[PDB]
Amino acid sequence: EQAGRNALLSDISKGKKLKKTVTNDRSAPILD
Amino acid sequence: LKIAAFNIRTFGETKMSNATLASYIVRIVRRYDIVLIQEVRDSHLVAVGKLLDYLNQDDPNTYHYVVSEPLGRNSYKERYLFLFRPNKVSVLDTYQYDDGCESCGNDSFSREPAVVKFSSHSTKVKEFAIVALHSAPSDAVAEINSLYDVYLDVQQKWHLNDVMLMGDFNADCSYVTSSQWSSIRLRTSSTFQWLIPDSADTTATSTNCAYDRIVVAGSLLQSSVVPGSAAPFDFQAAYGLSNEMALAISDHYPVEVTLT
Amino acid sequence: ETTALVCDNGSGLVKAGFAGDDAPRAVFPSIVGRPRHQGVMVGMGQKDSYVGDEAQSKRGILTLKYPIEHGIITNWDDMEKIWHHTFYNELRVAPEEHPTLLTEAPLNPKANREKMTQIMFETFNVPAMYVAIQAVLSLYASGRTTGIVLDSGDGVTHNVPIYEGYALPHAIMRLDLAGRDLTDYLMKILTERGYSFVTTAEREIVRDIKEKLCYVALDFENEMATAASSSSLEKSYELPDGQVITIGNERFRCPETLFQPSFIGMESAGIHETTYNSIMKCDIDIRKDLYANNVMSGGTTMYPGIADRMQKEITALAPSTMKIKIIAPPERKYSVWIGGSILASLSTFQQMWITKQEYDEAGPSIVHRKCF
Ligand SMILES: *[C@@H]1O[C@H](CO)[C@@H](O[C@@H]2O[C@H](CO)[C@@H](O[C@@H]3O[C@H](CO)[C@@H](O)[C@H](O)[C@@H]3O)[C@H](O)[C@H]2NC(C)=O)[C@H](O)[C@H]1NC(C)=O
Numbered sequence: 137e138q139a140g141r142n143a144l145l146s147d148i149s150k151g152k153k154l155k156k157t158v159t160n161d162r163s164a165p166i167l168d
Numbered sequence: 169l170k171i172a173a174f175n176i177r178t179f180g181e182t183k184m185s186n187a188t189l190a191s192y193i194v195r196i197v198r199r200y201d202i203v204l205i206q207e208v209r210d211s212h213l214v215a216v217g218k219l220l221d222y223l224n225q226d227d228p229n230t231y232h233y234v235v236s237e238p239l240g241r242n243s244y245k246e247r248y249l250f251l252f253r254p255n256k257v258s259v260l261d262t263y264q265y266d267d268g269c270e271s272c273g274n275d276s277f278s279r280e281p282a283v284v285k286f287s288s289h290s291t292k293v294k295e296f297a298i299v300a301l302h303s304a305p306s307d308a309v310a311e312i313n314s315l316y317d318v319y320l321d322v323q324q325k326w327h328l329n330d331v332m333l334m335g336d337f338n339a340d341c342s343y344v345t346s347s348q349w350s351s352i353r354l355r356t357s358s359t360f361q362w363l364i365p366d367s368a369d370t371t372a373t374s375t376n377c378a379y380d381r382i383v384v385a386g387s388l389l390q391s392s393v394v395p396g397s398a399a400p401f402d403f404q405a406a407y408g409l410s411n412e413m414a415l416a417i418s419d420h421y422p423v424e425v426t427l428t
Numbered sequence: 429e430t431t432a433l434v435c436d437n438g439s440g441l442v443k444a445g446f447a448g449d450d451a452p453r454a455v456f457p458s459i460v461g462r463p464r465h466q467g468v469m470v471g472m473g474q475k476d477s478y479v480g481d482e483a484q485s486k487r488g489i490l491t492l493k494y495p496i497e498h499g500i501i502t503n504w505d506d507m508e509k510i511w512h513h514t515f516y517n518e519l520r521v522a523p524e525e526h527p528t529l530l531t532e533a534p535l536n537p538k539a540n541r542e543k544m545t546q547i548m549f550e551t552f553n554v555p556a557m558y559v560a561i562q563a564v565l566s567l568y569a570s571g572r573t574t575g576i577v578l579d580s581g582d583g584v585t586h587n588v589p590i591y592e593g594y595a596l597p598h599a600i601m602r603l604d605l606a607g608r609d610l611t612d613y614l615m616k617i618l619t620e621r622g623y624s625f626v627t628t629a630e631r632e633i634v635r636d637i638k639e640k641l642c643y644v645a646l647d648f649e650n651e652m653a654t655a656a657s658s659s660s661l662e663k664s665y666e667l668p669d670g671q672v673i674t675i676g677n678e679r680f681r682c683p684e685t686l687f688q689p690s691f692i693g694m695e696s697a698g699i700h701e702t703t704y705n706s707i708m709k710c711d712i713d714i715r716k717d718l719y720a721n722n723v724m725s726g727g728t729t730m731y732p733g734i735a736d737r738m739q740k741e742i743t744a745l746a747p748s749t750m751k752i753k754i755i756a757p758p759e760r761k762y763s764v765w766i767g768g769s770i771l772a773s774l775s776t777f778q779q780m781w782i783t784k785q786e787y788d789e790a791g792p793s794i795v796h797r798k799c800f
């Protein structure tokens with residue numbers, strides 16, 4: 137129910153630029 | 169102390185899932201206080217796990233292990249596996265030959281040698297190393313010759329002269345011709361004594377090849393070898409196998425030696 | 429500058445990194461292994477346990493445990509090992525100096541949310557933490573606050589209606605079928621045509637074929653007809669050893685399971701039908717907005733064609749004239765994480781963290797009021 141929730145929801149609507157990040161993805165199958 | 173080196177053709181999940189063949193592999197391993205298994209094609213270590221499951225199903229400390237990552241110049245890869253009885257010896261340290269720099273071990277070897285330092289209380293040698301090598305058949309002369317450099321590396325890192333170099337060296341037939349022995353420092357230097365001779369047949373196949381070897385350096389270690397104990401172990405004769413069954417186990421015999 | 433952490437715990441994969449970033453720094457298996465035997469890797473010292481990518485690749489000499497089943501945490505000692513590996517090894521950071529956002533499955537039991545909080549504060553000693561519902565975060569990532577998420581991962585698939593930022597518990601649907609079942613079913617149908625996949629590597633290969641060659645037919649029965657009368661849908665796939673196998677209708681029969689769970693003996697409604705049933709359990713007013721805002725997230729929505737198929741399926745179900753829109757963003761494998769990174773780096777959020785100070789006073793059950 138918190139204070140400043142609407143402003144939060146408004147900011148989620150506006151969207152946000154996020155920063156370039158190289159993922160260390162270790163989910164790929166190991167194929168032999 | 170019974171020590172052995174054994175190229176088990178494509179040792180992997182399929183092979184160890186086969187109760188019969190597992191059976192024979194276990195019996196064979198059980199002969200030894202230390203055994204080097206080569207040609208481990210076991211991407212997630214499942215086959216290594218099964219074998220150990222069998223070796224330890226009674227006493228959980230019958231055998232301990234040293235295992236390498238998958239190794240190979242290209243996309244075809246193998247592991248080295250050391251199995252050893254902790255009651256008979258102890259592993260003090262281990263490393264992978266790297267030639268001083270990350271990918272630099274691949275400069276001499278397709279499968280950069282694993283090196284194990286053991287402690288042994290029941291033998292004249294109290295400490296020795298074992299260097300494992302399964303050479304690339306087409307570069308066998310250079311790789312066996314490069315082993316001389318591995319020995320220098322060991323000497324420098326562990327200040328230790330007692331070193332056993334062993335495994336499927338591919339050291340014979342069309343891959344090492346007799347005239348090429350004069351160019352392998354490992355053979356021409358008096359520091360090394362060659363226990364499996366050129367005359368030995370170490371293949372389970374039609375060929376007559378001393379492919380698998382055991383070389384020892386250091387007076388102490390040398391003087392600990394039981395005279396005449398080094399031989400290939402023909403498991404087809406030993407277990408009364410048809411040849412078909414022998415070949416389904418491996419196309420090599422273990423080569424073994426005994427220290428005292 | 430004090431940066432917040434974002435950690436999305438899943439049945440198959442942990443996704444972890446820093447708020448403010450466009451993607452996780454780390455994705456690894458949600459797994460913990462203890463060695464079944466005594467020994468070392470060459471060059472290494474002896475280890476009591478492995479986590480993540482290392483556990484997966486050494487599984488054969490280990491005993492594995494998956495602390496997260498169907499999205500819910502069931503094993504705490506092991507979850508603890510995973511979060512530790514996450515901070516210290518993967519993200520290389522000290523927990524005691526980062527706020528941390530954690531995610532939970534929908535319908536997560538309260539006691540669960542509390543134990544999560546308690547560990548964060550009393551074990552890892554974080555300065556502040558928060559817990560958000562996954563479906564909701566991936567809604568957020570798509571820039572919206574009302575709508576309906578279809579989240580399909582490795583063990584579990586949910587439909588989560590969201591209104592003004594709040595999930596609607598009463599209308600949530602859970603379907604117990606996801607990536608793993610899909611992998612198994614491909615393995616089953618590849619075998620049915622004579623191929624063999626029994627090694628660990630060989631099972632891993634099936635997953636690879638799934639992730640690279642599978643798709644959803646816009647019309648399953650027409651696709652069956654085409655494959656029955658032309659090679660136009662055949663696809664070569666090359667194994668490690670370099671020999672080649674062909675994959676025909678298995679490419680789209682595999683994922684069709686999502687729409688027809690009977691393909692694997694289940695009696696469920698398919699994801700199109702559960703999506704529609706969920707919207708229809710909702711307030712009459714909010715339904716237009718749910719239909720126009722159907723967001724898809726999770727690894728199991730990565731199938732080429734899936735959005736189009738959903739589009740068509742929903743239109744056939746819904747009122748003749750309802751505006752329908754499926755949002756299937758290309759980064760959707762990691763939408764949950766991404767929405768977490770947005771939420772936790774927003775200015776207007778910096779007041780909503782639960783602090784160490786608040787937890788000390790109120791206790792673990794403060795996580796209900798403060799994580800509205
Ligand atoms: C485990 O490994 C062994 C060794 O390869 C396998 O045994 C071999 O494979 C089959 C056994 O069914 C044999 O081939 C057969 O030959 C007989 C000849 O009488 C024939 O009747 C069959 O139609 C078939 O072609 C082979 O001879 C046999 N033994 C060898 C090669 O020494 C075994 O099958 C493997 N798998 C297990 C036991 O699960």
Ligand SMILES: Nc1ncnc2c1ncn2[C@@H]1O[C@H](COP(=O)(O)OP(=O)(O)OP(=O)(O)O)[C@@H](O)[C@H]1O
Pocket residue numbers: 437438439440441442498499580581582583584585606607608635638639640725726727728729730731761
């Ligand atoms: N391109 C792709 N196509 C189809 N499936 C994929 C693709 N990439 C990943 N997957 C599947 O997604 C699953 C993992 O998805 P995800 O990481 O979204 O779920 P999770 O968070 O681990 O588990 P859950 O959400 O069920 O608790 C795996 O089964 C994987 O094979």
Ligand SMILES: [Ca+2]
Pocket residue numbers: 369370371372373374375376377
């Ligand atoms: Ca022979």
Ligand SMILES: [Ca+2]
Pocket residue numbers: 437438439562581582726764
């Ligand atoms: Ca998930």
Ligand SMILES: [Mg+2]
Pocket residue numbers: 340341366367368376377378
């Ligand atoms: Mg000879």
